[PDB]
Amino acid sequence: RVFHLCVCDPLDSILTSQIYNHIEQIAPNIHVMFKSSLNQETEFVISYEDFHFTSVPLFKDEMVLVASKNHPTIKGPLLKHDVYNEQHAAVSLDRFASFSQPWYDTVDKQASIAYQGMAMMSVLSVVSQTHLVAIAPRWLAEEFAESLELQVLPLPLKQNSRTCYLSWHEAAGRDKGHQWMEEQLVSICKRLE
């Protein structure tokens, strides 16, 4: 059997490997395929989005600020009033399911952006090479803090979290294999807290 999963950016940058490697080990007969984009079929969606379709909130995901470890002027925590006086890297704001848009929804916040990339790993790579800052999930910053030489800081905003949801087509749940995968995906996702 083939399962088509959509794991949206940035969640795909840790969950895709975890899901793929696990299912590869315990069920080599099962073939899982992944897409990250939300343009429009697809058995399961893992995202920060609610589809109203069955949607299950899995956890509240803490967000943080990231910058290069080698930044010449950022070291310790920032004040809320100072967040948007830095230069920011973010993912494309205008697209559906944009990870970054909730933190740059006004003109003054958007003016701080110097780079809009396609995915959060592109954002992190640019941050690692520049003086730009970005807002990212804590698990993502920590996963790449050592390899990409990033420092992590608290996000001093009231909107410092995002809820991760597992979603599927309600009618499809009435199937043994669909239920097995649902259970598997809940376990793997919840390990992110």
Give 94's contacts (C-beta < 8 A, 6+ positions apart): 101
Shortest spacing between CB 174 and a second copy, in angstroms: 27
* CB count in 10 Å sphere of residue 14: 18
Residue 34 or 54 with smaller CB distance to a second copy: 34
Q: Does 167 bind a second copy (CB under 8 A)?
A: no
- The correct pick among 3, 36, 47, 137 for binding a second copy (CB under 8 A) is 36
Interaction pattern, residues 120-159, with a second copy; x per rule: CB under 8 A: xxx-xxx--xxx------------x--xxx----------
Shortest spacing between CB 171 and a second copy, in angstroms: 25
CA distances from residue 45 to 63, 171, 172 in whole angstroms, order as listed = 21, 15, 13
Q: Does 187 bind a second copy (CB under 8 A)?
A: no
Residue 130 or 163 with smaller CB distance to a second copy: 130
Tell me the residue type at 23.
I
Q: CA-CA distance, 110 to 107, in Å (whole number)?
A: 5
Q: Does 43 bind a second copy (CB under 8 A)?
A: no
Which residue in this structure is represented by tokens 């003054």?
108
